[PDB]
Amino acid sequence: GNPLVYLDVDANGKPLGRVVLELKADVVPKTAENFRALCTGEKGFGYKGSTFHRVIPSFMCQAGDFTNHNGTGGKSIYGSRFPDENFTLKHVGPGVLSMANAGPNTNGSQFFICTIKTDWLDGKHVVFGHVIEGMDVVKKIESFGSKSGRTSKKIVITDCGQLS
Ligand SMILES: CSCC[C@H](NC(=O)NCc1ccc(N)cc1)C(=O)N1CCC[C@@H]1c1ccccc1SC
């Protein structure tokens, strides 16, 4: 079946809880595998210890820049960047998990969790999963964002891994 992975999140050192994500390996196997392996840290690098660096209320929460911590960095398990696999899944509503990018075919490790339907991103960002449990945690993260994307607390992925 499709992998289940988790992110445990703190804000200013206080635990917020766990977000559990289903990765749609049935539809986007290459994109799902990249995220799965970055969660386990099995290639020697990954998301553990990195931050949600850009959070915009009523839009999305963005994370995954584990090299530069500012939205310029990250890398995939395949190389620095990899192509857009497909655009089959859509940004249907809150809880969608999608790849951040710097234009066509520039996927690395940065990702976002939507807090609304972001249909204008369909065909531009590769959707590859959804939140199974922990939308309450995502809403807490959202509450620490701002229009500029700057967070009012330091939001850290303290642990992550694979459940099944
Ligand atoms: C129009 S701004 C460029 C798109 C933007 N990119 C980045 O935040 N960071 C650049 C980046 C660099 C390397 C990699 N691998 C991934 C992303 C991005 O992926 N996203 C995901 C949702 C939040 C943000 C975004 C998308 C569309 C419109 C606005 C925004 S944020 C104001």
Whole-number Å distance, alpha carbon 102 to ligand 1 midpoint, is 6
Our answer on whether the CB atom of 101 is closer than 6 Å to any ligand 1 atom is yes
Residue type, 113: I
Count how many Cα atoms sit within 13 Å of the Cα of residue 72 in the half-sphere of its side chain.
2
CB 135 within 8 A of CB 95: yes
What one-character-per-residue DSSP string does 81-133 give?
A: -B------S---STTEEEE--SSTT-BSS-EEEESS--GGGTTTS-EEEEEEE
CATH number listed for the domain at residues 1-164:
2.40.100.10
Q: Describe the strand order of the beta sheet including 96-99 as a list of residue ranges.
A: 52-56, 60-63, 111-114, 96-99, 127-133, 14-23, 4-11, 155-162
* Structural biology method used: X-ray
Count how many Cα atoms sit within 13 Å of the Cα of residue 138 in the half-sphere of its side chain.
26
- Domain-wise residue ranges, the chain: 1-164
Q: Give me the phi and psi of 141, to 5 degrees please.
A: -60, -50
Could you give the CA distance from residue 70 to residue 95 in angstroms, rounded to a whole number? Answer: 23
Could you give the CA distance from residue 76 to residue 110 in angstroms, rounded to a whole number? Answer: 9
Nearest CA to ligand 1 atom 24: 100
Could you give the CA distance from residue 117 to residue 90 in angstroms, rounded to a whole number? Answer: 9
Q: Give me the phi and psi of 156, to 5 degrees please.
A: -120, 135
Three-state DSSP at 151 gives coil
Count how many Cα atoms sit within 13 Å of the Cα of residue 96 in the half-sphere of its side chain.
22
Our answer on whether the CB atom of 110 is closer than 6 Å to any ligand 1 atom is yes
**Number of other residues whose CB lies within 10 A of the CB of residue 62:** 21
DSSP state of 65: -
Whole-number Å distance, alpha carbon 111 to ligand 1 midpoint, is 9
As a whole number of Å, the end-to-end CA separation of the chain is: 8
Could you give the CA distance from residue 136 to residue 139 in angstroms, rounded to a whole number? Answer: 5
Could you give the CA distance from residue 36 to residue 92 in angstroms, rounded to a whole number? Answer: 22
DSSP state of 153: S
Name the residue with tokens 């990765």: 23
Could you give the CA distance from residue 139 to residue 134 in angstroms, rounded to a whole number? Answer: 9
